[PDB]
Amino acid sequence: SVTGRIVAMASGAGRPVWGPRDTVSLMRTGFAGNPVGFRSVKLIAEATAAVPLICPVLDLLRRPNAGQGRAELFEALIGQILLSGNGYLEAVCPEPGVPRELHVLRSDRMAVVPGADGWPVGYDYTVGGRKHRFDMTGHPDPICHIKSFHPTDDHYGLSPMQAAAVALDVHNAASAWSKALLDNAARPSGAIIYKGADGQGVLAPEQYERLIFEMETHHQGARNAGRPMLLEGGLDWKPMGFSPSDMEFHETKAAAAREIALAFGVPPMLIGIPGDATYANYAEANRAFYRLTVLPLLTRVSAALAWWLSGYLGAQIELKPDLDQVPALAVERDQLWARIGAAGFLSNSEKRVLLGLPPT
Amino acid sequence: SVTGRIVAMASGAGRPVWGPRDTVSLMRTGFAGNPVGFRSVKLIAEATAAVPLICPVLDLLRRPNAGQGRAELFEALIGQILLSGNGYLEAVCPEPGVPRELHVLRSDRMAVVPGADGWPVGYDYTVGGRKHRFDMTGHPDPICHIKSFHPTDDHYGLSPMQAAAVALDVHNAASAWSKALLDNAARPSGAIIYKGADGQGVLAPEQYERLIFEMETHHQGARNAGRPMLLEGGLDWKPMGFSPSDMEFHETKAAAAREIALAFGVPPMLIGIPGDATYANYAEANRAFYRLTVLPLLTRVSAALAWWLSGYLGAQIELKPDLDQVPALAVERDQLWARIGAAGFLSNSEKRVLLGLPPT
Amino acid sequence: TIRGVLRSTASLRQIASVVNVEATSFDVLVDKTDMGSGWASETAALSETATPQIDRITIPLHELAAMPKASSAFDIETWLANRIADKFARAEAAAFISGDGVDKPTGFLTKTKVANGAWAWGSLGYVATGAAGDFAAVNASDAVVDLVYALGAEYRANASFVMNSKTAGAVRKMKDADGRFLWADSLAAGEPARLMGYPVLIAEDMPDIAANAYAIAFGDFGNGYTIAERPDLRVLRDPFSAKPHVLFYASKRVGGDVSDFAAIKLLKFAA
Amino acid sequence: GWASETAALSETATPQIDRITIPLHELAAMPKASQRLLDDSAFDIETWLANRIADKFARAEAAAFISGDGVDKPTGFLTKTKVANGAWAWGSLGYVATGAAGDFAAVNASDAVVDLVYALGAEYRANASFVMNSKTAGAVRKMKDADGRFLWADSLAAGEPARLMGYPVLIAEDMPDIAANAYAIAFGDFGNGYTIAERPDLRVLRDPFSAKPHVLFYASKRVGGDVSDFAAIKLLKFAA
Amino acid sequence: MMLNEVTAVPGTALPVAEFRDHLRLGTGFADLGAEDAALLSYLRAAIAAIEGRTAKALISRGFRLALTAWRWGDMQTLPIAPVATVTALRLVDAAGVETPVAAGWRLVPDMARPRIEALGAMLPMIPTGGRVEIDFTAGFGASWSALPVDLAQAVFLLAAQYYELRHDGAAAMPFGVMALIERWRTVRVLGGRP
Amino acid sequence: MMLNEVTAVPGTALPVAEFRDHLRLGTGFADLGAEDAALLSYLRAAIAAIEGRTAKALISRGFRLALTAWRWGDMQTLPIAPVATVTALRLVDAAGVETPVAAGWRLVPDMARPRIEALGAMLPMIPTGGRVEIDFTAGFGASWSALPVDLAQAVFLLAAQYYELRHDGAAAMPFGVMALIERWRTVRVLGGRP
């Protein structure tokens, strides 16, 4: 408010503020690059789309636009929040109330404008060199801007991939270590050293094709494994080894494959990375997933759709996750129905009102 | 208060007191830098926002301002307390009672003024060279200042990240050790040593392109793994190794990743770090998390909102966490309902008054 | 927090007409003369009395650029952004006052001044003080007051003085025959900020008192001087060209000259 | 630079970054008190010596903040390589001359003040102040007009208006008085123009083990100071 | 990076009259008979053996360092170590327009790592194809007397050796040729990307 | 950090008449001066060998230490070890103006660490793009008699060697050349950042 008016004129009013430089490069190296960063976002964005909502307005959410369904919208929406900390939703309003179009604008090509009083007046969709300049100097405010929490910045989110940006580059390069080691490596299974009478001496190409053909036919392969291999004077066979055989950055990749899953908040058991057994039997780790990183994330976006879309309506609407018939929370529902169902002292209608039932 | 006047003069009345300089750099190096410091604050700040409250005043808290919801407010509020030990809340009052705007002022750019009697008279929001000088020489006192406990300082909090500031720099640099090891390392899978007749001798570019083409085609790669590799006079193949292969500061990183989680108070099971099984089965570790580092933090902040916001009202209001229908405390709720529900000796209304029910 | 030298901020931006323009130039359209209508005769031809010849003055909308190379205690991105915005706020202030034609806005001092009383359209009017070194010795401030009252009553509704610091110094140094400080009488007053009922703008790019220098201006710059500009500031956070130095690219484009030659009057310190 | 269209603009000068060091010297007092004198007397001697040490340090470092040299003690602004204003550079502080060599100028007193106020520069005058000693403010109030009345606080009653030319006055008795070339009046934004670094405690300690019949108190505080911004302090030279 | 010398030594700058005295003065056969211009041909062979092992220059000849891409962002260590005064940093393009620069860089002299070290972070970029080219004068002094005398003795210990025995014949001194050179060699421990 | 010499040794300060007594040339001949041109050519070649192995100076000629950035925040250890009375830390500017500065810098004499530590916790700052040359006269004494005699003997053990064998011809003493030098070398164990 009053502090915001002072903050604007420091950065510059009326001019675009970009924020993160590398957020276009963390997507290609951290979401199209490694499977752990890929699966972690896909595990969350496909979970928030599956959660039902509680309110008309949801008829817009069920069918926002052509080719982009209800579940496909939140996968695009949360998939921008996990990737770049910012969610955007353009609304096209031919009609005054409940605009019949929603569009997830990607956050690579969007930039904020601080405006006069510090709270934003412009958003700039910049593809190529071409802009749009959406306007926020009105009441309906055609873009909801969902921020992840950022303590240092005043206009953007923190994007958990930015917090895991070291552990992505460890996991990307340790996995590419073993790829290029299997592709650039010369191990021999031995070496036939031929010194000669001198310290140095080549063998003639007559003798050399004799040496290949007795090696090609009689010594290499599975079927020639272990021939006794007569060595006359001058010749000698030094068998080479391969001293680091397995495990090239095997644990530092597996520790970095856990820190990527740590930052987005998925448990190691759901994604499938190896590691020590923290959670027990998937009734917990799936319940932990829909309680520490999905439903807090989904109740924060739905609280912004409940306020941005109510600016198009007259009456304000609440919009919250269901927190009921979501089958990962069944262990919190067994535990609460068997507690009150076994409490026989209080009567029948006195516990339908506790469990959420329509009373009789 | 009688001793308040003595400490005020030493610091210097009417002049801003800053405290810790490097506070803004612990945010970029310890909260935007590593996932463990990132996840630990995000795990707490999204937990304290989810806890309901018990009182009018909560109508302000439900909708504090534009674009910053109820749950989004406490993430900004607690997210400053865990980061820099201080929470700030500006209230804008167009109306005389219950001011309809709340704004979390970030604690990097806020500074205290000791004033006359030691208790503060000014707060300074300092962006760029621009100050504001909020005034505390009045009755409504427009900013609540939530302190974490600091024994040595008289004006700020301690910010648990400061207590873990060594263990952050271990975890930041051990993770960057393995990154720059995967980026600065020359391991060869061998070396074809060519001495010659002399102790030194190069091979001609005719011979050198011959040596590449028999190495490029016939010896490198996965498909040429183990060719018998004839070495004539002068040539010799010394295979190199890579003697520390895995585990470059692997346990000191995994020990520092637990001491970061120790300072913020999250259990190791919730955040996802590997380690020995301390808690058992997530009915404990989630209940321990909402009892040692969330609900004590939330009942301390809500006790400051219960007193600062009651200064705008006439009657004082209490405001505490619910400690009921918070689904991490169900093992403390089964245990207390089945204790009194099985006590069949005392009658029906005598245990509705114990479990908290309205008697019938 | 890294400190810097605190430079002057007052820039003639807040008293001139700031017009957001998007094209390459801004064309203001001013008629040069009057209708010339006469009192008609009862038996006369009475035709084609006259027509105001219009004139387009072009604001070229030049660009301003500063290109520093960047080459964790303080963070350069915010600090250099808070220095280069100050330099773009201060370097355009010199162009608004004494800029010339080439690649930069032409300031109001560089517009071929003509002594008032022989004032034509293509110039700015001035009033002389007296002796060439300073204010007149016999009656100081007579040059100031007839500078005020030689302008025009329509523009003096909202007009302001434009000086630098050490010309307002020489104004406050004026004293009566007892030495009692005509402007802000005591040594306890301060800057009264309402010279002759009009505000004062301390713009440091004005010249100081010299042999012929125009150190004091007065005018309704809302009609007089038109600043046409684009509000944004370009931010090329460049990660190329030099690995060693970031070499940020920041540019704002801005133009402006006088739109109305009657609004601004100058004080020539000569005879 | 104003960038042309056919220019292919060159890179400009990155501003030089200065780094000025506060040395942070020590200041200690070691009074020697007798054990019998501390045990017999009715007065709280350990409290009274603390009061006199805390009175002495805040005045010794006050003189250090103004006229102390660089080595061994915090350097004051008046010791630094000053130059006439107009010939100002960063490695100096600016002065203006008053006229006569003895005192203020005879024909126009306070005219040496009103040009220094407007020679300081408009941005640092947002929160600036004057610094003098007592008998310079006496001579400032003794500036009269042609009639005999006072320029500053005209009535002979109701003195010390705490407001000189719109800016406050700090009577700091550690400045030189009016002399042949001395700089009695200083002006500017000292909050940006002078940085004080210090360890903010008066640690005091008894140890009878050094001098055994005595107690031999020892109190110490360390303060360092120099100028932060050279463009924020101007001075009056009473020479030319 | 060709780094050809612009001009060689004049030959009259070399201490041929002094090297005859290091060969046989105060003890010897007599002045004896030595092909004078032969003795100049062994000093140029001993200096060029110590100019290569030390990467010094010793006579202050003129150089021309024409290289395509800048290695660092701004640093550009010069190889021939004792430098003074870049003659010009002219910049030719792919066609040969040869547009010199006169500011933007400040040579930081040093016997260890002479640099170019431009102002800020911007060092003159290279026209695509148009190699940059740096002319400088590197060495101790114009005459033989301006040298460090221990390095001058390493020339005389070496040029006399090429005079005393012609073919590569076999023959552990405390300060030999090698021990006088080692405090002028370049001590580098980088094999890395920067 | 360039560290050149302002003035060389005079040559008349070198003990050529005593080095001739060392080398057993001859006592009462009428010539007596056929070697004077070469004997001081080997004394300057043996002092400059021991000035580099010990980082000492031995004749107290004047130096000029032209450097740009300070090695540590306040200390600035000087290379040539036995110093006395640093004359001038004149601070040149980016180009031209040379302003000598008293500047509140001290001098800590030592044979091992000849520091120039500053008293105001920060040495005088350096104009970006400009050097800070320091004139100082470093050495044991003015004449040859003011030297430590064992180091003076190590010149005579070494310059006699250059006089007796001209080229690098190989040829165990208790206190040889090397064992006299070693209590004057600089013993350092830091390869670190500070």
Numbering used by the authors:
A (entry chain 1C), B (entry chain 1B): 24 to 78, 89 to 393
C (entry chain B5): 109 to 179, 186 to 385
D (entry chain A5): 146 to 385
E (entry chain 2A), F (entry chain 2L): 1 to 171, 175 to 197
Quoted from the paper:
The genes encoding proteins that form Rhodobacter capsulatus GTA particles (RcGTA) are derived from phage DNA, which has been integrated into the bacterial genome. Here, we use cryo-electron microscopy (cryo-EM) to determine the structures of RcGTA before and after DNA ejection, and to visualize the interactions of RcGTA with R. capsulatus cells.
Asymmetric reconstruction of the RcGTA particle at a resolution of 4.3 Å enabled characterization of the interface between the capsid and portal complex. Incorporation of the portal complex into the capsid is enabled by changes in the structure of the major capsid proteins relative to their structures in the rest of the capsid. Residues 99–106 from the N-termini of major capsid proteins interacting with the portal are tilted 18° away from the portal complex relative to their orientation in other capsid proteins. This conformational change enables the N-terminus to fit inside a groove formed by the wing domain of the portal complex and peripheral domain and extended loop of the capsid protein. The asymmetric reconstruction of the RcGTA particle shows that interactions of the capsid with portal and adaptor complexes induce deviations of the structures from their ideal fivefold and twelvefold symmetries, respectively. By contrast, an asymmetric reconstruction of the portal and adaptor complexes of RcGTA, determined to a resolution of 4.3 Å, does not show any unique interactions between the portal or adaptor proteins and the packaged DNA. Therefore, the DNA is probably held in the RcGTA head by the tape measure proteins and iris-like constriction within the baseplate, which block the tail channel. Furthermore, the end of the DNA packaged in the native RcGTA particle extends through the channel formed by the hexamer of stopper proteins and continues into the disc of tail terminator proteins.
